[PDB]
Amino acid sequence: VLSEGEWQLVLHVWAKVEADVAGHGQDILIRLFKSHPETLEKYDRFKHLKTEAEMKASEDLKKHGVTVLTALGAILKKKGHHEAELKPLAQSHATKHKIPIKYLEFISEAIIHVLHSRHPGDFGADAQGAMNKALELFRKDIAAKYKELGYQG
Numbered sequence: 001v002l003s004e005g006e007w008q009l010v011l012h013v014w015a016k017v018e019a020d021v022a023g024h025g026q027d028i029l030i031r032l033f034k035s036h037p038e039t040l041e042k043y044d045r046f047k048h049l050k051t052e053a054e055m056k057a058s059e060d061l062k063k064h065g066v067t068v069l070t071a072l073g074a075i076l077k078k079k080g081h082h083e084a085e086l087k088p089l090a091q092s093h094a095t096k097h098k099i100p101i102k103y104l105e106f107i108s109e110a111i112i113h114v115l116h117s118r119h120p121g122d123f124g125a126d127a128q129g130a131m132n133k134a135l136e137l138f139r140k141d142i143a144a145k146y147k148e149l150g151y152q153g
């Protein structure tokens with residue numbers, strides 16, 4: 001469970017993300033693909049992208065990044081009270097896209113990397129720790145929902 005102070009640190013940096021959702025989304029997905037190429041090879045929609053420049057130029061990838069961060073932001077704003085938001089996400093990701101928890105760890109890493117790269121003055125040790133807890137809670141709760149659906153991700 002996160003303290004109220006921890007949630008406030010999470011939402012403080014998230015407001016910075018929201019100043020340019022598309023840009024952050026692109027950077028996060030590109031970082032994910034670079035750091036864990038196996039993730040991209042799983043996304044049929046995007047696996048044709050060969051270079052970083054191609055990734056940045058893709059309107060489709062940019063739109064997707066906004067979809068991803070919008071869903072995550074909606075979850076974070078509930079400060080743990082996120083069952084109604086998390087359930088549909090677990091449903092598609094367990095049964096349609098088949099995304100193991102390890103891949104959610106990878107994207108969590110990319111999120112933290114990009115937030116630190118862009119907002120170091122608002123993303124120091126304590127804020128990083130809080131965001132890490134928030135993403136940990138997200139992954140824990142989604143794993144439980146995965147199992148309820150019969151997926152051992």
Ligand code: HEM
Nearest residue numbers: 039042043045067068071072089092093097099103104107
């Ligand atoms: C922060 C974690 C994530 C969030 C919030 C998120 C969110 C979303 C949302 C909102 C959608 C569109 C609706 C849906 O199908 O559920 C989506 C689609 C999808 N996600 Fe995720 N996702 C996350 C992580 C991942 C990871 C790590 C992968 C792959 C390694 C992945 C693979 C996919 C795929 C393949 C689609 C379908 C894309 C398409 O063809 O349109 N997701 N995701």
